[PDB]
Amino acid sequence: YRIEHDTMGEVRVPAKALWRAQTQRAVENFPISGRGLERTQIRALGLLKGACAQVNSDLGLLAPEKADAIIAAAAEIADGQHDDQFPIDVFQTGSGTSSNMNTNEVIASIAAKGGVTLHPNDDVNMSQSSNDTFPTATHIAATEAAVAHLIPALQQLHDALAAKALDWHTVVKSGRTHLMDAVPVTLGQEFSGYARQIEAGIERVRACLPRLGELAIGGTAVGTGLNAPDDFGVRVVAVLVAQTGLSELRTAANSFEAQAARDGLVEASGALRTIAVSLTKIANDIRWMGSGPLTGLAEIQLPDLKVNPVLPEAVTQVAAQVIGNDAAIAWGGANGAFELNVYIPMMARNILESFKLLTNVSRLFAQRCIAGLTANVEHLRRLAESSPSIVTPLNSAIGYEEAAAVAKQALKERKTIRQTVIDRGLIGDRLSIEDLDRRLDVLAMAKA
Amino acid sequence: YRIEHDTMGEVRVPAKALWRAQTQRAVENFPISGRGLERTQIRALGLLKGACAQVNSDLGLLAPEKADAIIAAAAEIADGQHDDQFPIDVFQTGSGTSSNMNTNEVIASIAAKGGVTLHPNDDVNMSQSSNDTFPTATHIAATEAAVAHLIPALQQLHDALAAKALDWHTVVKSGRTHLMDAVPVTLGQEFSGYARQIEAGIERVRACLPRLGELAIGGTAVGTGLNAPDDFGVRVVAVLVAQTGLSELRTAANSFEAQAARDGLVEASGALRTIAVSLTKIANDIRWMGSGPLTGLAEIQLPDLQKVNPVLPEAVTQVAAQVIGNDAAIAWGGANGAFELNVYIPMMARNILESFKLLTNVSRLFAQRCIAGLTANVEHLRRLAESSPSIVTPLNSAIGYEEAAAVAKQALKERKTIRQTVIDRGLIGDRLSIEDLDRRLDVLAMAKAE
Amino acid sequence: YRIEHDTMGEVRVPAKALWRAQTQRAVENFPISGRGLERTQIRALGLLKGACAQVNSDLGLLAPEKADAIIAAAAEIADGQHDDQFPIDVFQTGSGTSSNMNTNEVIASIAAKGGVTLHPNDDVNMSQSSNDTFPTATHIAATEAAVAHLIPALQQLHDALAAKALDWHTVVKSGRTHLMDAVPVTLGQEFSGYARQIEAGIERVRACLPRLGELAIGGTAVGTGLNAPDDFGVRVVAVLVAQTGLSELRTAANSFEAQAARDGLVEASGALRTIAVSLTKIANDIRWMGSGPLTGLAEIQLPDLQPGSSIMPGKVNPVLPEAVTQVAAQVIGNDAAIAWGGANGAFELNVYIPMMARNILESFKLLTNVSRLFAQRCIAGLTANVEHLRRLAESSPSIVTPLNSAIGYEEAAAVAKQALKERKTIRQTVIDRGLIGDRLSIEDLDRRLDVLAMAKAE
């Protein structure tokens, strides 16, 4: 319940709080959602402030005692020790300056406990602006989410689907097109399709990384780098790559584009949206395959967590959320003006949530649904044995003309190809029953 | 770190948790977002369980000591005393069964501390199913959010915009179409338009209430009411109306439509999305009018909250973007129901209830901390209106369109009023008196304000 | 070809073209989509110009011979006689001024063929501006599309679904929740739900009309009505209402809101988007119910409309549910474009009107046409597989609950387990476990396991 002094009056701040007057003013200004920055965003702000202090110390602009104090305080923030010291709403000034100042104030308070006096702006914000910091922290967090978390979760799900594609390679069943009975396929072939969708999703995320990983740091207020060293960005990026192991981080190709727009977030959200579209098809097919057991398809059994398909439901709900988040991201992305896009906090919340939801639900889907599925093999074969057949595989035995007459008579009389052959008296020296049954065999028709 | 024995083995539950084994299993099943139900959600689940116990008591199905214990526990939940006892992810089974069971378990644990044993399922879930309760609670929460919170916040913003319209009635300035200079308006007329956008917003929310207030309660598992009293729904709705004062709550017109779809939430999100569209235009015009102080429009000054940056217009346009995204998620969930149940309810509820909250909170902040304190550069706005080439048309009948165009070009080049330019070019004479000039160039008259 | 002279220079225009130099310039300026105004928008521009000429005549501002020529020409345009004379891209100047000028030029050319000289701007655009005309025509077209076309088409679909709800009142089947077996319902109850969705859709459209029907006419360039009669809007609206019978048309509540924003189109699109969401659920349930017919649900049969496949010649597909679900996807896309344009107005004018108009009027048209086709070519001819549906209901573990009070919940679970294992009815499994006796008579068993009574039909 302490009291601090701002250039517009008094400011009451909780006693255990490491934040100062500017953060408290932002708390009072933006009571909108009641939610603040996520752990990933706080970590990236800590990483960035430590790297900037490191580079300011290397260039001789910041006394080594002050840099050491910022570096140690920043490492605690990056390590998750101060996730309760960031109370500002997501829906704040659209540069994210409020959160940038929150980080400067918390580092100054941590340093003061260790006996060092730091000015939040002149020391902790040295060579930085109110406008190049929060977007840099956003792109660090998004690139870490893509590379360290989403891609491995998607690979786990790909591997689970591919393992079923191989197990079920000869588990024949009926194909369905337009929801209507079609020629045979295998359950393994369908899973090979699901696995390719997830592999393509990993390709889509990898394709966005050259632009997602672009950082604005060094551009300062408008992109020109005024009041920063000319090589500030390239030096800070090198420290961040070294500390995180994220080789995908890079300086911006164009310092104006990197601050006037957040196009890299819009691009990345489109990859995540495409993954949500793929996951919707996979999850829907799996719940339909497990439907019933008397009123539905009853092709597979899902693991029980009459089992309701609770992980397909979680997957499809997550996909809906990614689709909505993606619309919010593109709306903010389009609406920048001149030197700055002022939708960064909202865009950051949405893209980081989409990464988190897809990573977590993919791992759960892989481990607690896909890996445990069991096929109802005898039921699936009975469905394959009820698919339509074709005459083509009889051509070499009865010739193009008799085959065509079998096709026509089967259609007219609503008979199978097999029975129409028997009924036309075609079993003989040209065609044994055995040869009929081998030519029309449903696993052979699946071409597995 | 207390222990519990489930149907399927052992479960460890935190010591001070009031939830039980089925909630803890859902915590383990759905570690997806790390975000659970919001306060409004949780309150409505308490309201619903209290009303259900009241009705089961009234019908002689539930012993009164048990009903009384449920009603007392449910009132604590409705009063927001147990918002920390609902740990299940939003991204759970799509009926919201897990959160329904979370409510039943917390009520049983609260009751147990007052010395009354309740079975979560057989007592707290009596006459209810796993499918008619969560969407009922969602529609209670959304109807309360609309009536009690968003409409009053929009009315505050409307009244702030209308007050500025009246204060700025005669504040004449150049009109802008296509971003280019146009004939005069007043700042008051522009604010009267903003006020109408917000008043139409309230009309849009009021128009969705007949269907937003429809509750599925009493439909049970598939909408038929099997295993519930025939009049359970109308009885529970009547208790909710009596307790809350929300007369907009009603039984559903069709019990199958009320469980197979969530179309009322999709409809209400469309009203919220329209309000977000209106707020985007109002907030964008206000930040543009405050742009400068040298190279921008410099029409008005915003109050300084943090040369003021337009931080509340930025909060408002960010909220609007979130409402538009949330709206897309809601419609996606709404379209994808199957047969007797739409299984996107927890995701739809998160998104609709967030949209109500953000619009309510940001509308009040925008009204109080931005709109109320705007100041206009009155004399500057009038000087620009009086200096615009757009106002030479009323001279054409005195001096011709060719001389009126030379006046417009010289006024702009020399940074002079049209009036001073007409005088400087020696046009005052028999053709045009000083008084006829001041009548033809009366920019406030050109704006046609009441 | 024939040549004309614009303020800029010389312009070549097609011989049979009733448009003039401004329209030809717009043709050369915006070769973007290769699609121009639809017939509903052209019709509305004709209605508007005819009403404006009538009022300008009544007020003594326009000579009667000139007003009479504009009225005659504008009636030809409203009657669809000139739908080939509007070549300008949708993607034009955002006020729609190019299309307004196209209308003025075509009316002047029609009048010229009857010996009357009309100035496109000073006569045909009298009392109007480049900014209050196109949004007025857009709202006339959208209101007409809602009231005269979509609501009747939705009522037709509602009536077709409600007729099935009555025909199938006793057709008992298992319910499905989460795609899993549930307690009994009737196919009539499910169709009653579909019907309510469409009835609610009509209520949604009706709820938006007080604001969709607001017209900007009379507000002129900025909303102030400068250079128009003070009562131009109310007089033009009176003529349009009398001539069209569109009682929903009204003068805007606020003349600045009606030009600075297009919020009524955003609102109306939300109703259409909600109808698309409802239609998606209805169409998806119907194609699933008709799936198979050997490997699917096979609950109903859809009328056959065309061959499905050359490789599998017997196969017929649910083509009308597919058309419906594809229309719904288009309406949801159109809705997103409309809200995008609606948010992005500046000051006195929203300059997204041609794009918003294209999208809202297309959503009306697609929903109207597909609703009628779905009602007539799919719903009306559905047939139910009654005995299949009842067999599954009578075999369902879900229906053992009503036995609990006779034999207890544990023995009822054993009946469920055995029946499901042995593919038997519940009735027959109860017998095969000799539970009929003192506790349970055979008439009593048949009363407890009455699956139609469990559906609780009214």
Next chain:
Amino acid sequence: YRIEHDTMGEVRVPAKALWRAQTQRAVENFPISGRGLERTQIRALGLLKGACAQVNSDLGLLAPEKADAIIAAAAEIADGQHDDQFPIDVFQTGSGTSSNMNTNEVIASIAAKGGVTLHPNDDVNMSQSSNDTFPTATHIAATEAAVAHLIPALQQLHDALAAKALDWHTVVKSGRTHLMDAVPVTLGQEFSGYARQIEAGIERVRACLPRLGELAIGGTAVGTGLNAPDDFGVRVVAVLVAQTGLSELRTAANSFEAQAARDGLVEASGALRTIAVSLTKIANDIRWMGSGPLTGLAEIQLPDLKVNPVLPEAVTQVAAQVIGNDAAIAWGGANGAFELNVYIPMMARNILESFKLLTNVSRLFAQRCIAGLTANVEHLRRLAESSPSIVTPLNSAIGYEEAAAVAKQALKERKTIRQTVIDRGLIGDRLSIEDLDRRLDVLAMAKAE
């Protein structure tokens, strides 16, 4: 009318139409939008039918005389001689069955004029299904639109923006953040940012081509390739690459994914949506720069088509349409079932429209707006030199309090910062003229030379 027939019986068809019974049933079943396939789609179906007949001929499955007749008729269709013979609505059966049969029937009728009897299904549809042909035609049309049309249009717009970036490299002006005055930039720097957004757009389109160019051909009804030669897809793709020169066309990595989903269209629409987002920012900044001529920013003048910013308005309306189309595409993409995604005609309409609108508006914007912009150079510099934002580098010489008084007086008197520092008598005690001109050099402050 004349009588034609199919497996469902007899159908009345317009006496002279080149389509037959299946197309006519589709005319009556789907009168929804009143719009059919676009020129690009009809071209792709013609290309594909010709390539299929070449491969069936090469494998000895189809008589050379019949293959020649198909190839010639398919060439007339691809060239646009028979577009009026494709009457079927976009909103047809979701596999594109109806438009596939339309192509087969029209080819058979054209071949008959030349005295060759072709069966639309046994000959023109040999080794094919609608399930692999209609999505193949859609991905051909989309790949061609990306490579031959949109990337060159974007490169023209990039080059026009980059030409301004160079021309305006020293055109110093006030920076704007939050719409508020900020430290100096140049118009050239802002245009270099717009140019980067369009170059990144080109990178985004190129990044999607490995998947957009995947073709389903050879997968037949369910992806298994039943009723087609095992190498049909690889042979047909080789013919298409030879004929079109589109090396980006390729056989699908997985034949089941290529028919059960249209994820490549969803992916490509995301690139187009991102370009729409970039174009919105560029066009909105340009119309604001041109605003006025008295009460707006008045930084630049747009070419006249007091000019209204009509091409910025066309660009921002096109962008809105691409965003809407992108939502419709993703909705269709998610909703496939089992072996087939049945939203292909609607997804094809939307993604091909987005390609076309972005191509056409990008070239118009480049040639008829960007190329002709003029800057109010001396005005922009005067405002930059008069902004309170540039007083900061004086703080160390005159103090915060006096730098604030300089800013306030400069704004009130409408004078430069340089002239205000002189007027307040700060030269000599605080700093010299040499020092003043170094500290307030706005072009140096923009970090431009």
